[PDB]
Amino acid sequence: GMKNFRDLGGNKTEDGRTVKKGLFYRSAKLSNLSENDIKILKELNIKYIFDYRSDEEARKHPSTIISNIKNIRIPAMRIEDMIDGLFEKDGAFNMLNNSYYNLPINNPSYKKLVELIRDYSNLPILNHCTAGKDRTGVGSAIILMILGVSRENIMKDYLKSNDFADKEIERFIEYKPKFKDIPKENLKYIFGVNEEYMKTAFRRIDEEYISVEAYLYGEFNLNKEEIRKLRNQYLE
Ligand SMILES: [Cl-]
Ligand SMILES: [Cl-]
Ligand SMILES: [Cl-]
Ligand SMILES: [Cl-]
Incomplete structure (x- = not known):
């Protein structure tokens, strides 16, 4: 089927609401x-399916075409x-940590993603890369x-x-059976994820901005009233 796939709905917010189901999905590649x-x-x-992959990744593993679903990469x-x-x-x-340090700031891909989700008429959306x-x-x-x-629930x-x-x-x-005795937790740093990676992305945000709200305003032009409006649309 499709791998590493989930709806972001059901997550709890700090103000006590819950993200609505059926609006935001994430997954691994869709080839x-x-x-x-x-x-x-x-x-x-x-x-909309929103694809973060490089030109070479998309050339080697093109997404399957779906009638009536538009793909943006x-x-x-x-x-x-x-x-x-x-x-x-x-x-x-260390290199993957450094990649996370460089992801959240001045990212044209995330800027476009946020632009998309600012309008209810563009939803539902699915966002994916290679491993998701x-x-x-x-x-x-x-x-x-x-x-x-x-941040705890994001993690x-x-x-x-x-x-x-x-x-x-x-x-x-x-x-590669020769690696069958490598500690699985070690292979998870390559095939999976670890708290330190996301903490590095958070650390970049915190070095540049005094708060998550300031980050969203500085990077995506999301002022407080616009965030309030989106939350009223997308939370229950
Ligand atoms: Cl899976
Ligand atoms: Cl920027
Ligand atoms: Cl082998
Ligand atoms: Cl943590």
């Missing part, structure tokens, strides 16, 4: 969808080798910030990608 997968997405009435970024040097100075843990975990992690976190979800939704990671780790060990 080689079955006709049943297409039926699911059509029955959810999704209007804007790149949000500018295995054996990763495993060996995983924790070294220039290794994959890093670029979609920060983009979905931004949606949740706009909606008023706490919980972010870490849900580790269920997909567990399946990806098993798939990888089938491909």
Whole structure:
């Protein structure tokens, strides 16, 4: 089917409301969808699929076409080798952390995503990258910030990608049995997500802005009254 897929609805906000279901979805890539997968997405009435991937990723893994669903792609970024040097100075843990540091500020992809979600007529939307975990992690976190979800609850939704990671780790060990005794928690830094990555994205926000509200105003021109309006539309 479709991997790492979930509705952001049901998350609690700091003001006591809950995000409405059926408006914001996130997933991993949408290539080689079955006709049943297409039926699911059509029955959810999704209007836009928002793709964070690079030109090369989209060329190698084109999304399946769905009648009546419009696709918008804007790149949000500018295995054996990763495993060996995983924790070294220039290794994959440090490099992925650095990617998260660079994601939330001056991002043309997230700016377009926020522009889309500012109008109810554009919803429902689905946002995805390749694994649905890093670029979609920060983009979905931004949606949740706009909606008023706490950092603790943003982190919980972010870490849900580790269920997909567990399946990806098993798939990888089938491909390369020589790594069957690498600690699974170590492979999760590559195939999954970790609190430090999202904390690095938060830290960039906090270094640049005194509050999440200031960040949303500075990066997306979302003033307080506009945030109030969106919350009244999208929360129950
Ligand atoms: Cl999954
Ligand atoms: Cl900016
Ligand atoms: Cl092997
Ligand atoms: Cl944490």
